[PDB]
Structures are given as structure tokens and as C-alpha cells.
């Protein structure tokens, strides 16, 4: 009973997390019905179905080449398609060779060829260039070759077997691709933009709410969760890569172009990760119980404040532009003011106001100043990268 | 020609990277031959092969359930096994129901059941609890149910079809598992230990060679590559998870136990990542062209040096123990001396020797002192975690 309730509760949590995870089941269902309706009503004239396995093969390929995205269906489909053709060709030919050899060695020779081919192909699987986008093609190549070359049938029906396998595969793939590109689609590149924009906004929110915590200007658990929310940015390496890879087979679905540079998206993601690198260091200083007396804080309050405010506005403005997919240069004035703020702080440091203080408490105050200066420089670099990701791609 | 040479050159690079990537192809080959030799010589009496697809199914399942590890074959095998049984059972039964209904609705009713079942199963696929280790079971469940319930055969041969499918699957899985656990095996947990030990050693090497660079005690590209080698530690999140998941199906292969706590391995990996977090910050200070005059460096040389030396020895000693799989407490004396070093530095800071210096160059020197103190504290925490990962598991 309690286990049943826990299972049910996860249902609403997953369903309400994303409304598109409950409409994809109906799509899988409509697939497995449309394909299984063509055969029964056998249109476009009659067929052969010599081995009586057309229905099984058509149904099977529709379940394994239908994935959540629309950039993981074309790719899987194209692999399952080509591989079979090539493997079949090489197969039907091989059977001719063994016939000439005779009637006793013929089975032994066939085994040797399939052994060598399987070993060579599965060694290629370990390469770092065919593993990112071609891990399925090699697997189907081994599968199709071994099935056709060692089916156990007679030599006067191998051509029909090869034709039947190819026909079922292409029929299933065509139906699966059409559905997922007509009735309520889900694109994969469009899930890389929003992810990048959310990362920008999350960092901005933390930066815009730093002066209150650091200067003690002020429930506690709720505010802690709001502050400590940068973990996502630091824990999204394995996901920004995949979605980028999955988004190279997409067609030009409207505004997005054929050659959209997703490589720059990963580069900008790394730069945002570097900003979050130092942010985690800064946050640990605040969380720590040890503290320095608040009185000193006012002495250098003015310079530190300016940095936090201008930094946050720059990030937020960029996420706004990157989202609406329109280029802008509003962040230039904000980063310029931040550079002016650092120069003013340096001029203030000439006066040496920070003298006559305890060196032990000085170490903590000094480290904070260090982190802020890097974030001002790091933001400047990120500004250049974004100012070009919106130029190589058409952001009109 | 040039493309051919590039392809060939990658061959030696991949082959010499790991000698075990060239012996796994022969294993795949021996598999696809042994299975295909049983049928031809039909031992243990004769069989039926009513539909003439036993050879195809046996060959097919051997190519898709053979993976590089030995913790990704049992798992895949067990899934492909159970799923079919359960799905078949539910299938043969469903056919009985439709018969009672009549002879016209019978096909329409069957389609409705398979539609509902497919939609429900593929929604479960999106859960975060059945995706880490059970993403294959659901897929085979949909596959087997849809094939049996919609094969298109007569009602007097469905039982034989279900029996044939189950028999081929179990035969292929048994052969594939036996090979990969008898002739030259490759374990997956054993590839998590060495990875953790290598991470420990890499961090130690950087820490043990910090005083020379920071104090200018001293080709350049070679030394830069030796220093800047911490990227691996920071870029191994997506791999320490997988290998851990793949290593829950392993049997007690000798010293390793049935319930080895790989969760603690991931926790120690996160702690090492936190040490590498701050290490990258420290390295960027060195790389930067801007510098502070070397003269001041000697003033506080003694405290900083001690920290680097003792820190490195502690890491190295641990990797030695963790590798030979024997517990030790040699790192206790090293971290204790580091704590003594920090107290001595604090006592030196009482005297305020660092006065009468330029505040602008002071910021850089001060930040370095900050980073070192955290690494001394962070190392202490890691010592506690390691001192228990070797206790929950049997490290005798």
C-alpha cells in the first residue's frame, strides 16, 4: 500500500515537471497502430510475405527507432537504414562465393568470413571518432551481416530475404520519422537555447543578491535554497554535450539554420562554468561560521557594492537577448562601469585606509576582494564570446 | 591516400592506449561461432524449428548483449531474459480473450490492448528511478509483447512461438555470459579503483611541484603540460557515475565483496573534485603574466613551503594504500604537521612583518595564502572519508 502510494506520487511529480512527457506516450501508440494497420488492409496491391515475418520486423523496428527527441530519430533511422543495405549486399555476394567452393567447405568458409568481419567491426567501435554519432551503425552492420550470411536457408531465397529485410526497415523508419515531425513535435536544439538562457539567469540572481548577505543588511532555509542554486551550472557537463550532438540532424525548422554553430554553445557553457567555479568558492566564505566584525565592512562598502550590482545586470540583460534570439549590446555599458569601479577601488587603495587593522581578520576581507575582481574580468571575456555566437548564426 | 594513413595511425594510438581493446574482438568472434555451431550439429537430440528462425534469433541476441565490460553483460542479459518471459505470458493469455469475443472484433480488440500497454510502458521510461539500471527491460517488454500479440499467425501456434522466442534468448545469453566470465575477463569495479588511485596521484604530483614555480626557484611547453594536468579530475563526472552503476552486477570475483560500497567511491570522487576546484584557481594566478617582485617572496617563504610539501606526501601515501587495497594511517602524521604549520604562520602573523608594503601587490600575495589554508582543511576532511571507505569494505 505504502509502496503503491509512493509510486503514484512520483507520477504527478514527473507529469507536472514537463507537460511534454505525457503526450509522447500517445505518439508511440499511434505509431505501433498505423504500421500494423497497413499490412492487415494490404493496400497498394498484394505482397509476398514468403517467410511470414514482415509484421514482426515492421513492429520491431518501430519500437527501437522512436526516441524522445526529433534529432535522435532521424539519426537512428538513417543508421538502421544504410547499415542493412550495405551489410545485405556484402552478404548475398558472399553466398555466391561459397557455392563455387563446393558443398562441404561452403559452411566452414561462411563462418570464417563472418568471424573476421565481426572482429574488425567491433574493434572500430572503440574509436573516439565513430563513437559520438555512429555507435549504432556498426552494431546494425554486424547484426544484419551475421543474420543474412548465416540464416540457414537455401541459396535460391537469399535475395528475397535481403529484399524483405530492407523493405520492412524502410517502411518502419519512414512512418516513425513522419509522425515525430508532423503531430506536435519536440526539437532538440530548442532545448539547448533555453538551457543556456536559464544558466545565465541563475548566475545573475545569485550575483544580484550578494550585498545583503555579505554586509548583513538583513525563512533561513528558504533563503539558503534560493542562494545555493548554482549547483546546476556546475553539474551540466554531461547534458550540454549530448543535446548538442543530438541537434546536428535537425532540419531547418524555421528560424534555426542548417549550420547553426552548436560548438560555440558548448564554449559559452564552459565560460559560464568558469564563472560558477569561483562563485562556489565565494559562497563557502559566507556559509562558514567564522566572521569578521561588521564595523570594518563599511570602510570599503562603496566599491564592493558597485561591482555586484553592475555584474548582475549584465548577465540578466544577456539572457534576455539570447532568449528572444535578437542581438544587443546593452551589456557594454554595464561592464564598462564595472571596469571604472575597479579603477576607483585601486585609487582608493592608494590612500591605504585599510591600515591599523588586525592582520588575522584582514585575510578574509582581502580574499573577497580578490574573487570579485576576477568575475569582472571573466564577465568581460564572456561578453566577447556571446557577441559572436549571435553573429556567426543569423539572429535577425 | 592521406585519409587512409590517418585512419591507420589512429589504429596504433587506440591499440597501444589499452592492450585489452584488441583482444575483445576475438571474444565477440568466438561467441558468434560457438552459438552457430550448436544448431548445425544439433546435439542433445533433435529439435523443432517450426518457423525456421531459431538461427536468426540466436545470432541476433549474441551481438546485442555482448558489451566491453562484465557488469554490462549480466545486466543486459537478465533484462532481455525476464522481460520476454513476462511479456510472452501476458501475450499468449491476451490471445485467448480475443477468441472468446468472436471473429470480427478479435483483431480490433488486440490492437487496443497493445496500444494501451505500449503507452503506459513508455511513460514509465521517463522516471528517474528506472532509468539508471532498467532502461533496457521496459524496451524489451514493449518489443516482445507487440511481436507476440501481433505476429499474424494462427491461434494454434502462439504457444510454440512464445516457447521458441524464450528458448533462443536464454541460449544466447548463457553462452555470452560464460565466455566473458571464463576466458580472460575484464571487470568493471576493478576499473573504478585504479581510476580513483590515479586521480589521487595526479593531484599529489601538482602539489609536490608548486614551490619551484611560485618562488621562481628555476622545455617550457613540456613543463607546462606536466603542471597543467588536473583537467582529468575536473572532467570525470560522467564516467565515475557509469562505471559505478555498471559495477553492481559483478559477482564476488575474489577479494571484492558482494556489497562493496561504490557510493562512497563517488563521494570521495566529489571531495577530490573540490580540492581540484581550488587548484585551478591557484594555477591561473601562476600562469598570468602580471607578477609581484620576488624579493617579498622570501619574507614568508618558510610557512608556505611547509604546507605544499606535507600536503603532497599525504595524498601520495593514500593512493599507495588505496591501490594495494590495505588500510593505513600514515597520512595522520602529515596532516598533523600541516595543522602545526598553519598555527606557526598565524603566530608569525602576530608580529605584523608584512607591514610597509605596497597594497596593490599585497592583494596577490594574500590570495595565495588563502588558497593554501583551505587545501589543508579540505585534505583533512578527505582523510576521514578514506579512513572509512576502507572499513565498511573489507580491506584486509
Numbering used by the authors:
A (entry chain A), B (entry chain B): 1 to 218, 225 to 402
Kindly provide excerpts from the paper associated with this entry.
In plant cells, ALMTs are key plasma and vacuolar membrane-localized anion channels regulating plant responses to the environment. Among the different ion transporters and ion channels localized in the vacuolar membrane, the ion channels of the aluminum-activated malate transporter (ALMT) family play a key role for the transport of chloride and malate during stomata opening/closure. ALMTs are also involved in transporting various anion including chloride, nitrate, fumarate, tartrate, citrate, and malate. Here we report the cryo-EM structures of ALMT9 from Arabidopsis thaliana (AtALMT9), a malate-activated vacuolar anion channel, in plugged and unplugged lipid-bound states.
AtALMT1 shows aluminum-induced activation within minutes and mediates voltage-dependent malate efflux conferring aluminum tolerance. Addition of a detergent LMNG may have introduced artifacts in protein purification. Notably, the purification of GmALMT12/QUAC1 whose structure has fenestration employed LMNG for purification. To check whether lateral fenestrations are artifacts from our purification protocol, we determined the cryo-EM structure of AtALMT1 with the same purification method as with our AtALMT9. AtALMT1 of the clade 1 possesses no fenestration, and the conserved threonine residues apparently stabilize the selectivity filter. T61 directly interacts with R80; T84, T144, and W57 (W120 of AtALMT9) make a hydrophilic pocket for positioning of R165.
